[PDB]
């Protein structure tokens, strides 16, 4: 286990500092187009849904002291289609229980790409109407999706993502659900950078752990 | 100037896990209260515009070194009317360029309650609409206010904060703006835990300063 | 919530609805979002103000005020 | 950009629909009002199709816009003896205004 000072870089295609924050929000792409899967085995795999530019990284331990960066996380990998694509080197899930019965759970993944690639994936962005007076107001995933082209960079640290809202009783998880058009979705650690890109060099610090 | 490592307390009312984060918008009061003003002389003040609690704080040096905490920043007080309430314990400017003459600043402070005190405060959110294709949607500010009452509790820490829109830059800002209506508000480090109260136990480091 | 209506056109709420009041005035057209922010297009000789409970209008069907703050947003006389 | 009505239009359950064209923001609560003064009727995102009625025009009007374009429809039911007619779908200013479709 490890504490993470990510930097955030420049926002990644098609983001923009002055636009939304797109995200892969089904488990499918058009034709002859794959997701990005992260996959433990064959079985399980949560589908990568937002997408992050991480210019550096700074490991501290627990106790907040200098550290080296850890070897990749091994087992896990990123993969499109049937070929790797990345490292996983720190994961970590934000569990939020909205209900009793209802569940959020947000997936952090930090990677490094062995090799680039790109893939057109349909994107789409948090949004939360206007209310009156002062009833509650969601954060749901628009319904509509824009096919959009997603660059990777070798060398290149990423930081990945997937919630899933996991209805009923469950102990980690690794549930991949698609981002639902209309469940209202809780903001946690793992969401707050996938609203608007972030400022370049800000540093977000997060506790990340380096097993399953 | 030392690093704070701010353990997010609940949820302070009106706010809850499952509502969206309500702040401060104007910088005038219903009648029969007052703002919360960072005042450090009659010219130079940050009125509060989104106010959270924190649970606890954990103060480090700038290589994260352990340390004790910090003598309160001379000359500041967190006065509602004429009477201080509060001692500022650190503070922090965070100055993004949305445009090469448009900036945008968000100062925060992190505030000590001496004497328990509550007041009603116009509040509003950020709401993002929905847009067709994909078509730019800016994460504005609900024009429409809403009075609502703020309890700020004796001996307990507090994460106040200040945002504002300058044109045309001095070379500390002490420009205190309202939340403009039909203005995008560029998410920002200090900004990002205003979209939707944050769970219990959520830890946020910052780097905030001790003097101007 | 119960909103009277009686140059200065006033429209005083029954219970505090902070700034939450739009005014209307063929189908009738906005003129104030928030009761004090001038819409595109409208002349400038328009102006609303007020913040608490009474909003006065001066301009320098009639002038409909619709209060947004509860369930069903109501309209003057 | 601009809201049209899809004409004029006892007992007999008639929907009163108005359909907005030109538009780039979708969920902004269409609006929903009657005039014989003006009077609320409800309120439906074009986006969630949420509705919240007066409740004095509940079990009355049923409000279900449609998803793929965007237009009003005002299920109203058990007509009695007025007219029922406008819809305001708003946006960041002067955008939502609509022809009211008198029902006699």
């Known amino acids: 286990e490890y504490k993470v000072v990510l930097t955030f870089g420049s926002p990644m295609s098609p983001n923009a500092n002055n636009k939304q924050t797109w995200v892969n929000k089904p488990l499918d792409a058009p034709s002859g187009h794959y997701n990005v899967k992260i996959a433990k085995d064959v079985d399980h795999y949560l589908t990568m849904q937002g997408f992050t530019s991480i210019a550096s990284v700074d490991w501290y331990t627990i106790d907040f002291q200098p550290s080296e960066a850890p070897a990749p996380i091994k087992g896990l990998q990123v993969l499109v289609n049937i070929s790797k694509k990345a490292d996983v080197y720190a994961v970590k899930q934000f569990v939020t229980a909205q209900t009793n019965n209802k569940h959020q759970v947000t997936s952090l993944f930090l990677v490094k790409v062995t090799t680039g690639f790109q893939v057109n994936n349909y994107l789409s962005y948090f949004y939360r109407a206007s209310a009156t007076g002062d009833a509650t107001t969601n954060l749901l995933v628009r319904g509509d999706t824009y096919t959009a082209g997603i660059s990777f960079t070798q060398g290149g640290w990423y930081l990945l993502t997937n919630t899933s809202i996991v209805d009923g009783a469950m102990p980690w998880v690794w549930n991949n659900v698609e981002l639902k058009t209309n469940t209202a979705y809780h903001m946690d650690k793992g969401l707050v950078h996938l609203i608007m890109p972030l400022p370049e060099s800000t540093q977000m610090c997060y506790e990340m752990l380096t097993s399953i | 100037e030392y690093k704070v490592v701010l353990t997010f307390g609940s949820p302070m009312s009106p706010n809850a896990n499952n509502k969206q984060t309500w702040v401060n918008k104007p910088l005038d009061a219903p009648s029969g209260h007052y703002n919360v003003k960072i005042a450090k002389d009659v010219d130079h003040y940050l009125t509060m515009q989104g106010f959270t609690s924190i649970a606890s704080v954990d103060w480090y040096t700038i290589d994260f070194q352990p340390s004790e905490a910090p003598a309160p920043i001379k000359g500041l007080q967190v006065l509602v009317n004429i009477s201080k309430k509060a001692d500022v314990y650190a503070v922090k400017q965070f100055v993004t360029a949305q445009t090469n003459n448009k900036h945008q600043v968000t100062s925060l402070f992190l505030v000590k309650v001496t004497t328990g005190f509550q007041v009603n405060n116009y509040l509003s959110y950020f709401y993002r609409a929905s847009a067709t294709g994909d078509a730019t949607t800016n994460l504005l500010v609900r024009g429409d206010t809403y009075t609502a009452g703020i309890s700020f509790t004796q001996g307990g820490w507090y994460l106040l904060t200040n945002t504002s829109i300058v044109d045309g830059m001095p070379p500390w800002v002490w420009n205190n703006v309202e939340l403009k209506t039909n203005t995008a508000y560029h998410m920002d480090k200090g900004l990002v835990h205003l979209i939707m109260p944050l769970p219990e136990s959520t830890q946020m480091c910052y780097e905030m300063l001790t003097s101007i | 919530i119960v909103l009277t209506q009686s140059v200065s056109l006033s429209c005083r709420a029954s219970q505090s609805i902070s700034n939450n009041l739009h005014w209307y005035q063929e189908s009738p057209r906005l003129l104030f979002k928030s009761a004090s922010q001038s819409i595109s297009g409208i002349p400038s000789r328009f102006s609303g103000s007020g913040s608490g409970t009474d909003f006065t209008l001066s301009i320098n069907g009639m002038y409909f005020c619709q209060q947004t703050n509860s369930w069903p947003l109501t309209f003057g006389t | 950009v601009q809201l049209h009505q899809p004409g004029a239009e006892p007992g007999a359950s008639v929907n009163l629909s108005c359909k907005a064209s030109?538009?780039?923001?979708?969920?902004?609560?269409m609006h929903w009002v009657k005039q014989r003064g003006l009077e609320w009727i409800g309120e439906?995102?074009?986006?969630?199709?949420?509705?919240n009625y007066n409740e004095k025009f509940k079990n009355k009007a049923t409000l279900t816009v449609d998803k793929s374009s965007i237009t009003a429809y005002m299920h109203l039911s058990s007509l009695t003896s007025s007219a029922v007619y406008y819809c305001?779908?708003?946006?960041?200013?002067?955008?939502?205004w609509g022809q009211g479709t008198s029902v006699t």
């Open positions: 305001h779908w708003d946006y960041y200013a002067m955008d939502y």
């Open positions: 439906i995102n074009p986006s969630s199709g949420r509705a």
């Open positions: 030109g538009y780039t923001f979708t969920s902004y609560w």
